[PDB]
Amino acid sequence: RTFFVGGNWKANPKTVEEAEKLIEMLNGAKVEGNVEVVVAAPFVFLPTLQQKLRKDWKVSAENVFTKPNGAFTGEVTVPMIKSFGIEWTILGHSERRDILKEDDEFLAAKAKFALENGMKIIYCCGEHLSEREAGKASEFVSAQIEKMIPAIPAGKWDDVVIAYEPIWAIGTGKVASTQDAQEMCKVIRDILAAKVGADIANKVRILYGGSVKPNNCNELAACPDVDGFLVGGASLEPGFINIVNSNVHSK
Amino acid sequence: RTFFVGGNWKANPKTVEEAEKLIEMLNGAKVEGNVEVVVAAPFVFLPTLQQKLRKDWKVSAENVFTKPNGAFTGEVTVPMIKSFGIEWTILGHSERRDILKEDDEFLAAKAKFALENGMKIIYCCGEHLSEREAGKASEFVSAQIEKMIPAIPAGKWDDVVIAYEPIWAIGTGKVASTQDAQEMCKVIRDILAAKVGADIANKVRILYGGSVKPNNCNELAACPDVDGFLVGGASLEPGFINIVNSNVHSK
Ligand code: NA
Ligand code: NA
Ligand code: NA
Ligand code: NA
């Protein structure tokens, strides 16, 4: 499976000038090994990112709606994104599930519509503190993946990437170890194998989407079931390149 | 009060090519009388709208978040919008209150942050079918406006426009008359007068945000307390210009 690194800028930077500076930085980075790099940015910066970003990397939206267009004030749709030539979106990020109240049925509908319309998706999942403390992480995560599975059309698993977020380690006072990341990526892979078969499970990139930095990316990349990263704050910094280049430690 | 017409494209059109065609159409329209025109479009089309739209009109976002930037995947913020030179946003549209579950506290926080950061806002309100049928429209609408009022900083009411949406007449099987529009715009004006004083109430543009078309804009514009429109589907059509030009019938 080709190592995969997505840079999620989240709601940053504040200005188009800063977005442009950051893109110029990314454009000059020397990538080593073999890695698929995707960069996700706020909607209003997507046109400039699409125009200016190095052509060997791909741009991603950070969310889309469930419909092609219509009476959905404030929402951006798959056709709009594709009209710029953008091929990816993130879906189901913990911040949207939590702050913006997106539920599993909404997210399944987005995955279905996105894929049926030629998009590739980075679909996020992961359990909260109480399920982690109860030792019920795999059950929680399995229920999420099981909502996702029926949305994937036949022949589209090549267009699906899954990101595991250890939400239990985000603003909770607990930290995730390298072994935690490996264990949950493997839990997801096994759920896929059981539910949709080994051939799909062996192809789907599963990413670690907890805290990824230059000081922990090499050890994380080396975990056998970690196929890359959905990077948060380091996406905005020169250390993003170290994370991209961690692929040489994954086999 | 200067007549005010906002064109809310909502989640339309599907493609940047269509957005550009529509802007070329708007650019050649002959406006009559005196009217302030604002055009709101999906986030990904805002840069091209800002670059290409006639300079005597202003661009608007259809929503913004409550914060300047941060861990809010999918969200667009006031600084991002302003970095393009965009001066307006819509807030609290019925579609966002309903479909995207935005509550009055979220919306008050957005109004406060937006105005404290130099934005102008079109703040939407309006009652649903049951409150309309119960004859409790003014109570419902007053509660909304009362949540809004504390968010407005001193000296910023010149940067506030309020749009009344008859949600009870949207997908319910009931239609709004011209007298309904007038009555609710007046209810809002009186709430302002009582709560923040006559000088503010006499300055604030209150718009009708129900169904506005070339066949009903002139009669609506003539209502004394209707100061313009937040236009839905006709924003995407040549009839938008008829609606802009209805200002000559308002006194
Ligand atoms: Na395929
Ligand atoms: Na690995
Ligand atoms: Na002022
Ligand atoms: Na009038």
Q: Which residue has the tokens 């709560």?
A: B195
Strand-strand pairing, B120-125 and B160-164:
parallel
Domains of chain A (ranges, CATH numbers): 1-251 (3.20.20.70)
Q: Is-catalytic flag, B165? A: yes
Residue numbers preceding breaks in chain A (C to N > 2.5 A): none
Angle among Cα A57, A62, A63 to the nearest 5 degrees reads: 135
Strand partners, A201: none
Nearest to B73 among A14, A16, A95 (CB): A95
The residue count for chain B: 251
Of the candidates B164, B178, B167, the residue with the CA atom closest to the CA atom of residue B223: B178
Helix (H, G, I), strand (E, B) or coil at B18: helix
Nearest chain A alpha carbon to B89 = A74
Dihedrals φ, ψ of A137, to 5°? -65, -40
Sequence-distant (6+) residues with CB within 8 A of B205 are B1, B2, B3, B4, B36, B161, B162, B227, B228
**Residue B11: strand, helix, or coil:** strand
Q: Among partner residues A12, A47, A71, which is closest to B44 by beta-carbon distance?
A: A47
Which ligand is the nearest neighbour of the Cα of A217? 2
Q: Which two tokens stand for residue A49?
A: 């990112």
CB pairs under 8 A between A and B: 139
Q: B118 — contact with chain A (CB < 8 Å)?
A: no
b/e burial code for range A67-97 (CB count within 10 A of at least 16 → b): bebebbbbbbbbbbbbbbebbbbbbbbbbbb
Distance CA B94, CA B166 (A): 9
Amino acid at B145: I
Contact B205, B1 (CB under 8 A): yes
- Tell me the residue type at B35: V
A36, A62, A93, A102: the active-site residue: A93
Contact B104, B141 (CB under 8 A): no
Tell me which chain B residues have a C-beta less than 8 angstroms from the C-beta of A76: 11, 42-44
Per the document, the length of chain A is: 251
Tell me if residue B93 is catalytic.
Answer: yes
Give the three-class secondary structure for A238: coil
- According to DSSP, residue A234 is labeled G
To which H or E segment does residue B122 belong? strand B120-125
Distance (Å, rounded) from C-alpha A124 to C-alpha A222?
21
Q: Alpha carbon of B56 to those of B39, B87, B120: distances in Å? A: 11, 13, 16
Beta bridge partners of A230: A6
- Within 8 A by CB and 6+ apart from B189, the residues are B201, B204, B206, B225
Annotated active-site residue in B36, B62, B93, B102: B93
Q: Which positions in chain A touch B50 (Cβ < 8 Å)?
A: none
Query: Which H or E run contains B45?
Result: none
How far apart, in whole angstroms, are the C-alpha atoms of residue A201 and residue A192?
5
| Nearest CA among A78, A101, A65 for reference residue A159 | A78
Interface check B10 vs A, CB under 8 A: yes
Q: What are phi and psi of B156, to 5 degrees?
A: -110, 5
Q: How far is CA A75 from CA A151, A174, B12, B231, in A?
A: 21, 34, 9, 17
Of the candidates B55, B44, B115, B123, the residue with the CA atom closest to the CA atom of residue B85: B55
> Distance of CA A191 to CAs A90, A188, A202, B97, Å?
21, 5, 12, 37
Note whether A243 and A233 are within 8 A (CB).
no
Contacts of A42 in chain B (CB under 8 A): 43, 75-77, 80
Which residues in B132-161 are b (16+ Cβ under 10 Å) and which e? beeeebbebbbebbebbbebbeeebbebbb
